[PDB]
Amino acid sequence: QLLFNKTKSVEFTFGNDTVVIPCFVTNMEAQNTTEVYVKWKFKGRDIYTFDGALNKSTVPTDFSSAKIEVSQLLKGDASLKMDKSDAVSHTGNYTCEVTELTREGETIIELKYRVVSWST
Amino acid sequence: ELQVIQPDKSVLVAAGETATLRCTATSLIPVGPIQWFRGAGPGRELIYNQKEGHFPRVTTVSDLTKRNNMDFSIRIGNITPADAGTYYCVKFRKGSPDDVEFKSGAGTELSVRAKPS
Ligand SMILES: *[C@@H]1O[C@H](CO)[C@@H](O)[C@H](O)[C@H]1NC(C)=O
Ligand SMILES: *[C@@H]1O[C@H](CO)[C@@H](O)[C@H](O)[C@H]1NC(C)=O
Ligand SMILES: *[C@@H]1O[C@H](CO)[C@@H](O)[C@H](O)[C@H]1NC(C)=O
Ligand SMILES: *[C@@H]1O[C@H](CO)[C@@H](O)[C@H](O)[C@H]1NC(C)=O
């Protein structure tokens, strides 16, 4: 399998304009992005996919801001980036699934909203 | 072209012992996983994949964390008659909302026999 540097959860507040969901493969050994496939699942639904063979990123229109920095894939970084409107409407557990040729693996991260104090 | 080879058509195992289900891929392309199932069709049972899942009785013959690994053989410990059936080593291509079966091995019939005493 592909092995991960696991984070149980990440928190964001009213203050985050954008949010990052970490995903880090520790034994990534890919030479090219054509060898890689990425799936980000939110409550079992695919909300971001990257098909390396077609260099194609796909997101449903309710998750329009969802993206990964494709250049970081060879480093094992498949972290998901989204804007606050998508984060606030999709809090909960995410699964990050990565495939490199025939090796595969996944990890779960909870995106948690934290209510804090603000000055008008 | 890819071949998923199950060299054993059958395996006979004494109850309580370990079954070895052999599988080798001739290639690691197209991108996609190899999984083991019991049975074929709609009601086939997932027996193993590389993800963290619930396959406690399963160990792999080789080190599947290796990029160049082509051996997908598994071992199932403490065999009982309940484990009997035909096992398939199956290759998928990646897809959303579902990965698509690409190639399957020919199957290995696991049969079980009583152990003395
Ligand atoms: C996860 O893994 C790397 C080690 O490979 C570690 O150095 C890094 O701090 C970790 N990532 C994060 C964002 O904590
Ligand atoms: C939200 O913003 C803080 C900094 O203000 C940052 O440390 C944190 O990683 C952000 N949360 C997420 C989930 O991106
Ligand atoms: C990846 O391989 C494709 C051909 O399969 C090639 O077009 C592309 O430029 C390669 N990229 C790198 C960074 O090697
Ligand atoms: C997220 O999943 C973990 C188990 O991996 C569970 O403990 C947690 O309660 C889940 N959170 C939600 C809000 O579903």
Author numbering:
A (entry chain B): 1 to 120
B (entry chain A): 3 to 119
The authors write:
CD47 is a widely distributed membrane protein that interacts with signal-regulatory protein α (SIRPα), an inhibitory receptor on myeloid cells that gives a “don't-eat-me” signal.
The two most common alleles of SIRPα (v1 and v2) are also the most divergent in sequence with 13 residues differing in the NH2-terminal ligand binding domain (total length 120 residues). In the DE loop of SIRPα, v1 has a Leu at position 66, whereas v2 has Ser, both of which interact with the NH2-terminal pyroglutamic acid of CD47. Ser-66 (v2) forms main chain and side chain hydrogen bonds with the pyroglutamic acid lactam ring, whereas in v1 only the main chain hydrogen bond is possible. The variants differ mostly in surface residues on the common Ig-like domain and distal from the binding site, so from a protein structural point of view, the suggestion that these have different affinities is unexpected. However, the values we determined for the affinities of the other SIRPα variants for CD47 are not significantly different from that determined for v1 (Tukey's multiple comparisons test) and are close to previously determined values. The polymorphisms in human SIRPα lead to changes in surface-exposed amino acids, but we show this does not affect binding to CD47, which shows no comparable polymorphisms.
